Amino acid sequence: MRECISIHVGQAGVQIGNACWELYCLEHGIQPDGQMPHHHDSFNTFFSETGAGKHVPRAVFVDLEPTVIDEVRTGTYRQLFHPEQLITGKEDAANNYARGHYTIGKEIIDLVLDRIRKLADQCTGLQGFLVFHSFGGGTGSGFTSLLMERLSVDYGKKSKLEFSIYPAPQVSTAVVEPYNSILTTHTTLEHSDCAFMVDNEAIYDICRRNLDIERPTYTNLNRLISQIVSSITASLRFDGALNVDLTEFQTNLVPYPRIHFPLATYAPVISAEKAYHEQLSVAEITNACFEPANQMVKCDPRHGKYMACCLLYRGDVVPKDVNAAIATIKTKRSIQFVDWCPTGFKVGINYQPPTVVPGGDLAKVQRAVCMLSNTTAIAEAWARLDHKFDLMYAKRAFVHWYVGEGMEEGEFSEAREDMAALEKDYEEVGVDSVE
Amino acid sequence: MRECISIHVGQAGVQIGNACWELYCLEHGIQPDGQMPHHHDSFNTFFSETGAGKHVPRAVFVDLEPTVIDEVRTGTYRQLFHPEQLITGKEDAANNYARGHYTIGKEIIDLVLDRIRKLADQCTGLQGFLVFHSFGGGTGSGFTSLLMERLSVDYGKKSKLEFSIYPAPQVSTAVVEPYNSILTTHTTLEHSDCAFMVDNEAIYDICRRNLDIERPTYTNLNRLISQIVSSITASLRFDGALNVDLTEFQTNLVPYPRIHFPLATYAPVISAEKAYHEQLSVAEITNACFEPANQMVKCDPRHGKYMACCLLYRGDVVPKDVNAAIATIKTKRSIQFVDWCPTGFKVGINYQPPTVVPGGDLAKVQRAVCMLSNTTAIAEAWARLDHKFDLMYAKRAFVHWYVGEGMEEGEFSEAREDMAALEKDYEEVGVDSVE
Amino acid sequence: MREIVHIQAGQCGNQIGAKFWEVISDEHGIDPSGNYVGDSDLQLERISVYYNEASSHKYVPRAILVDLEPGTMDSVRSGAFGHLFRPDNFIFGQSGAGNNWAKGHYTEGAELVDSVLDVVRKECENCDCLQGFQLTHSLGGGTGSGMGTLLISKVREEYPDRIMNTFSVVPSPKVSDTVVEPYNATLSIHQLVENTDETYCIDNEALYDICFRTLKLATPTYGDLNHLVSATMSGVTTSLRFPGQLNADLRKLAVNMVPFPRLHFFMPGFAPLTARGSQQYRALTVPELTQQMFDAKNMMAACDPRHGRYLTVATVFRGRMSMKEVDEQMLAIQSKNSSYFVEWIPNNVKVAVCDIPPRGLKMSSTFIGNSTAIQELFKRISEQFTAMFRRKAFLHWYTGEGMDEMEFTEAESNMNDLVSEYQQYQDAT
Amino acid sequence: MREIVHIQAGQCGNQIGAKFWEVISDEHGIDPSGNYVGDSDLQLERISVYYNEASSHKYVPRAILVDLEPGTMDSVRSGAFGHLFRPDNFIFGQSGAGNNWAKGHYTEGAELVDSVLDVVRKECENCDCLQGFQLTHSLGGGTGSGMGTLLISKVREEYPDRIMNTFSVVPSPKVSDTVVEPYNATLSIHQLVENTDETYCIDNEALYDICFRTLKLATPTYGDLNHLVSATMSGVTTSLRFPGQLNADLRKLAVNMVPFPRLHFFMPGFAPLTARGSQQYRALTVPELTQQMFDAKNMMAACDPRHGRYLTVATVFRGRMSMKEVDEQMLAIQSKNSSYFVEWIPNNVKVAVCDIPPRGLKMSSTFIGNSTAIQELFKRISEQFTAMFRRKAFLHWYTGEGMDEMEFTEAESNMNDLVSEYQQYQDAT
Ligand SMILES: Nc1nc2c(ncn2[C@@H]2O[C@H](COP(=O)(O)OP(=O)(O)OP(=O)(O)O)[C@@H](O)[C@H]2O)c(=O)[nH]1
Ligand SMILES: Nc1nc2c(ncn2[C@@H]2O[C@H](COP(=O)(O)OP(=O)(O)OP(=O)(O)O)[C@@H](O)[C@H]2O)c(=O)[nH]1
Ligand SMILES: Nc1nc2c(ncn2[C@@H]2O[C@H](COP(=O)(O)OP(=O)(O)O)[C@@H](O)[C@H]2O)c(=O)[nH]1
Ligand SMILES: Nc1nc2c(ncn2[C@@H]2O[C@H](COP(=O)(O)OP(=O)(O)O)[C@@H](O)[C@H]2O)c(=O)[nH]1
Ligand SMILES: [Mg+2]
Ligand SMILES: [Mg+2]
């Protein structure tokens, strides 16, 4: 009765959604065809139901290249999705923000908004939106900027959560990542309620070091991020000793309107062969979450200050142990919050344990904790992008595509100014107060 | 609830640990896989436990050559160890202290300290540390010096016990033993709480003469030293009529801060065929312990003075007989303590008999006694090393490896000066007081 | 007669209320179906003070459960002891306050408050001679705090004569379960010192410590803490829900414990508290309970009383006992702690005695201390507030609902005025 | 009335206390569960002096078991006669004193002493008319010595009126169970001569010799020695735990045996001591016990009395006997040993008589002699101390906890002052 739709833009969004919906169907014992042989309703928040025992997701799959969507239509989760949700374009933006925001996406945006409005009106207690999109791809950035603007125009005050894929400092599959990233950030900065920074480089490191898988496929990273998002929405979708809604997330983790970029982290992540030999203490897993090597963004947290933290626990958890572990974390020195925020934690506890996907890589654990942490180290990452942008702009490289596809140079200058202003605000927050 | 971790550095350390953990698993009826079909908890001090009936050791196996650690991973005690404890390097220090303390070990020391800190924080009543390392090998000396410095920096006042392997006067498998030994002693002299001198030459002699095994393997010596260490920690791990902790060991056996080098001795050690024909009197086994031929360091105790002694008994022992035997020992002339210490004994009594390992070489005995004795004869041994060092330094032999691997000559001169100062202090203690 | 109406705001309020009604029904011998199967007539002699006799000889709690989200409401409804509440009382919203006080007091709450007041009025008219209201809520969560303050203001407008009790879960000193709780706490305290007759400050930290240390439980689930607080409240009301050699009511406690209108914040305590094994190894004597109730390690508010003075003290016993014993114990405890009491209030202990134990036990006791130590709490909060208000962090979330900075300015000024008054009366002479 | 509180410090203290409470319960007919199954009302007429009647008609020892390590504590707790102690009394630390006195009196003990004093105070307030305290400890081990001295100082600060007993296991002359025991012994003696009413010097060597020679046991386990010492203490207190033709209490013994404040160190002795077979072959007559209690081979302190003079002597009998017989025996024994007594104290024998034997026997006897021989002990220790202090061996271990050399200087000076006083009064005229 507290619904929240899902929106998947771009190839990354669609693949992540594949993983996430596999995980959901496993959580609620739902067949790929929508049938089903502590639980409350629970699945009602993400599954709508027809007369028969068939349930459908509240998701929208939009893309400009029909390849991946066609794979979904042919995927084992074929009978699941309502066929109208699979909006396919004809020619992808091809890692060009201009195409993805002015030329191509502009011509299906209306149909996308139509389906969005249909699914919204069919629901009653709509909590908000979940956007799954990359950052470098043309469709992702462009269509996402357009979609966020349209939604903010239409649905003024409702939850809008985003899951970007922060481009890695060194592993850049595309070449024009800085341009698209800068443009999409400069646009989305005034509409997104709360983003969720995740990067593939950190996930590679985590998969190799912890899970002891040397050669991972994209499916594995998708499984990890799906686990994170499932932990995020378990509070809505399940009964817990201390529940929490997305509104609480945006309220607690966003001190200033512009600074709403918290990074993700999850634990425990160990191989099934290594499942034993460790009791998985709640304080232990909390320390694991706070370790710089277990974070999912390549940024040393010791270089910044945790402006806010949100720890969400599920499984056999007891509040006093959580309190003790959090107090111990506060005692440590290298974790220095901002002076003006003495209360740097919101906690969430759930009874439903995390579910391990058969054919997966993780081990069945009795407890799990996801930390969404808004820190100051992320500012440094922006600097890197800044740098690259200047380079690719000092020579006016690649500019002609963007210019000829519905954009002006002054827009690029303005986006650079906006990113510089954001970095300035981050520094301004980083200082301490007098008196 | 009084935990004490174990640290095994170098090939000798790892093999000794293999023997010691075999002995422990036999003591508490623990399968190699951590399962188990007077006792208290007892095993809690050295075994941690997970939810299931699986227990793991509180040990760290660190080496720079993966051979022996891989053997452990393939050993019958495979399921026992938590896989993270098996830290393996890539290239051994190759009997070079410089490599083991400046070049190679410097790059895994942080991970080792991390695992140490994890295991420490998981424990509550940590008594202290047990270091198992040789003296000649590069990894042993170098990594041990580094580890002791790091631990003393981090864990200021906690028990730090060491089990060196004193290089034999004549049986030297390596060639550069004096250099590494002098360096590691000069370093560890300011950090180690209490060492435990043992040598392979004496153990060879004991195995041949007493156990009547002419051709012993390293496994046999490892079994002997494991028995010694088990007797050392039985007081913590079992209920006795007069218990004793490692803090008591360091307090009683260390009169002066520098002079903390007690040598080991154990009894009874007889073959199973010779198990009969002797009733194993408590006074008898005490005399056996005090005989120069049963000591585990090739140094005639009659050439020095017992500054302190610590006799630890286990099995069917009665205090009055111990008192009588100790009085008789004090009566004898050839055992001349220092005049200024009239009380040269600390006693420990345990109820748990020593356990004989099936497939072993010793015989099931009802009583056993381990003597840790800090004497003055050990000084002479240093002299021998001194001599050799001067020789290998009078010609500057082998110097170039150490120089080119991160060391300076003045450091060698300083180490020689420190060893000379220690010998001088030993002589100064050896004198008698006026008035 | 003297019918009492129960209000439960916020998730914490609802959970505490569920445990509370469980305890009350257990006291009165009430089946989960809501019908009576008890054994002592005295149970039903005053069942009407908390229950209403619905036709066909059934009983319904006189409670009003309020929320802005259906989650915990439905959780309770499905659970046992849920099928006895009258379903029309379950008022809940859909938007959810989002842990924001502005939503809970200006935008979202303003839409349900009317229906809530209507149900309140209906229940009031059902009662014969209304005694007063007890509100169960938190101070951190947006719904509890905001909507409870709104309802309190409205009720006090509609009932300037009845009595008002609030059982607020004050934020812990060390930990902080949320991030913006200083703002909600400050605004809630503003409204409480405006229009509340008495407020029972309670912390989860102290309950954790009591469960761990005293009761020897390393696994305290929220059910345990809620059970403890519910036992406290039941002990508070048993003085009128049952006969007694020296009976008391809510009005008497308010009269005795509130020397000045603003200074109506109380730290509670309970006794005896024994482990499962360590119980038979102690004598259950009135002196034992009395000495137990006077120490830092048994106060449900995280503040050492020795830091201040006991302005007033109330104590409610249960079960059969000897009055002279209680008198002597109170005399001795007031004599030995001479430095810990206000000079100009001699004999500052109120005593009430019931005839029924809370079941299972022979004799229990409840302590309600109004001290000057609690000011530290406010001081702490005030400081935090100033910090978070100096940089104006999160200020936009509350601004967007119509609230303005001057609101926080006034609330902080009021809190500092209260702190000044508390300190002034602490060192009075 | 005259309630007594028991403290047990150190491993030896705890073991001795366990055996002691076993013996006491056996005397009073107390089941291991802690409930009474006895047969004589006189058992419960004064059960309250050592036990507290917990509700449901159970009994708990009024003891306080203290340690810095859980080992022996848990060992006792698991053992029978352990499940009757009230679990809250088991105060223990984790670091362990490491057989160091500095830790046991400055660093480690300073952290638990507060909780220990709190439990002490609670027990004191539970008692009606407190009589005094008995401390069971050693002098070699760090925990026992240091923490006991600390607690003694604190208690004497909080109770300058009550009476204090200490049962210290003095180091043996010949053997030395530890190495640094001279230092701990000297410091402990310093604190004892500071703030102890009476001290019962006991050696393990003498107990060994008594068990071997007299009782004909070649296999003396520590249980036997602890049983003997516990029998001694029980015989000391039976004069007030039971009626008697000439009753005595701790205060009377302190008055009679302590002519001067510092000279309050006593060597005890017990009788009769017979083998299992060699018992029926001897007449159990008062003269026999009397002559048994006066010889070197039956003193629980390793010092021949003939080397000095009996400054004072106390003797407590049990069971039915004829007073005139005791009087004549004391007269004869004082006449025949004229050279062994102080000249200026005529009739230096205190006599007490009980009505109950220690069970199984017909008549027993306990001797408490304050002699000048014991000075030799101190002399010995002093010498050793000087030796170990001249070379400053082990000095760093005690230095590292804040203690300084001047501490040892003062303690040794004080000990030599005491030795000088003892010798001075030995050859007084
Ligand atoms: N974490 C994760 N990222 C993915 C996955 N698949 C694709 N991506 C991201 O997708 C990016 C590739 O460009 P996309 O954003 O997918 O471009 P697109 O979605 O195809 O849209 P167009 O640019 O118009 O073609 C890479 O930078 C990846 O980070 C995946 O399975 N897991
Ligand atoms: N007592 C005993 N000593 C052993 C055993 N195995 C090896 N050692 C000692 O190990 C020494 C050989 O050099 P190590 O100290 O092992 O060198 P390492 O541990 O391999 O480290 P690197 O020098 O860097 O290779 C010999 O002097 C032996 O004394 C054993 O099984 N028992
Ligand atoms: N003592 C106690 N406190 C609780 C319990 N459940 C929640 N809380 C407290 O309630 C606060 C959350 O407020 P909540 O009602 O959930 O948020 P709201 O919906 O905005 O009112 C937290 O600070 C918790 O400390 C409980 O069972 N017992
Ligand atoms: N008579 C007797 N003495 C004991 C017994 N157990 C230990 N001791 C003595 O206690 C001393 C050890 O002190 P201990 O309490 O164990 O060390 P601590 O922990 O530092 O106080 C030794 O000198 C022993 O002689 C016992 O059962 N009987
Ligand atoms: Mg694409
Ligand atoms: Mg090696």
Residue numbers in the entry:
A (entry chain A), B (entry chain C): 1 to 37, 40 to 42, 47 to 441
C (entry chain B), D (entry chain D): 1 to 429
Paper text:
pmcMicrotubules (MTs) for m by self-assembly of GTP-bound αβ-tubulin heterodimers into a cylinder consisting of laterally associated linear protofilaments (pfs). During incorporation into the MT lattice, GTP hydrolysis is triggered by the catalytic glutamate in α-tubulin (E254), which becomes juxtaposed to the GTP in β-tubulin at the longitudinal interface between dimers. GTP hydrolysis has a destabilizing effect on the MT structure, and polymerization can only continue in the presence of a GTP-tubulin cap at the growing end of the MT. Here, in order to better understand the GTP conformation of MTs, we used cryo-EM to visualize MTs assembled from recombinant wild-type (wt) and mutant human tubulin in which the catalytic glutamate in α-tubulin was mutated to alanine or asparagine (E254A or E254N, respectively), making them deficient in GTP hydrolysis.
We also determined the structure of the kinesin decorated wt MT to 3.6-Å resolution, with both datasets consisting of ∼20,000 particles. Lattice parameters of these MTs, both undecorated and decorated with kinesin-1 motor domains, were nearly indistinguishable from previously reported GDP-MT structures assembled from mammalian brain tubulin. However, there was additional density in the recombinant MT structure corresponding to the internal His6-tag located within the partly disordered acetylation loop of α-tubulin that includes lysine 40. This purification tag has previously been shown to have no effect on polymerization dynamics, and our current study confirms that it also does not alter lattice parameters compared to the endogenous wt mammalian MTs studied previously.
